[PDB]
């Protein structure tokens, strides 16, 4: 619900009592499907500003990875904004998570801005972090689990 003369647009909370976007929200996935058009226009501009951590609560999703290079700078916002623009009241695209490619040496890294990160430990197929490398240095070493 929008508010007059410069007042925050209240986001109708669960109990059915419009609350304000600058806070911590829990988005029952289904909701996020018949609502993105809104999400992206009021809560999204908010999350980027770094003032409204939101938990999209979806049971078990498919998950696309995207390894970028920690050397160079990157801002994970568009590989997310796009994912949002592909959510119909019908179906959502496999949640995409950006992940730095694990380096061998101790490289200087560019401050990247990330947003998507799962709560449950869904890193169960990593297998190995730097097969050939004599030792991973910046990436997350993941010695072949015995």
């Amino acid at each position: 619900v929008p508010r007059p003369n410069g007042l925050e647009p209240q986001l109708i909370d669960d109990g059915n009592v419009p609350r304000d976007i600058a806070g911590d929200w829990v988005y029952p996935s289904d909701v996020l499907q018949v609502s993105v058009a809104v999400f992206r226009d009021y809560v999204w501009p908010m999350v980027k500003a770094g003032r409204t951590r939101v938990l999209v609560e979806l049971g078990h999703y498919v998950y696309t990875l995207h390894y970028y290079d920690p050397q160079i700078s990157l801002d994970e916002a568009p590989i997310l904004e796009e994912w949002l623009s592909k959510i119909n009241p019908a179906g959502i695209p496999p949640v995409p998570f950006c992940i730095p490619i694990p380096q061998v040496y101790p490289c200087i890294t560019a401050r990247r801005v990330h947003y998507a990160f799962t709560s449950e430990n869904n890193n169960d197929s990593l297998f190995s972090t730097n097969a050939a490398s004599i030792d991973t240095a910046f990436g997350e070493n993941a010695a072949v689990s015995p």
Binding site: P2, R3, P4, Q10, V17, P18, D20
Partner: peptide, 16 residues
């Protein structure tokens, strides 16, 4: 009565 200039619904206008 400024925050009430534009009515959206019955729910009373109050934030945090």
């Amino acid at each position: 009565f400024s925050h009430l200039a534009i009515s959206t619904g019955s729910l009373p206008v109050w934030s945090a």
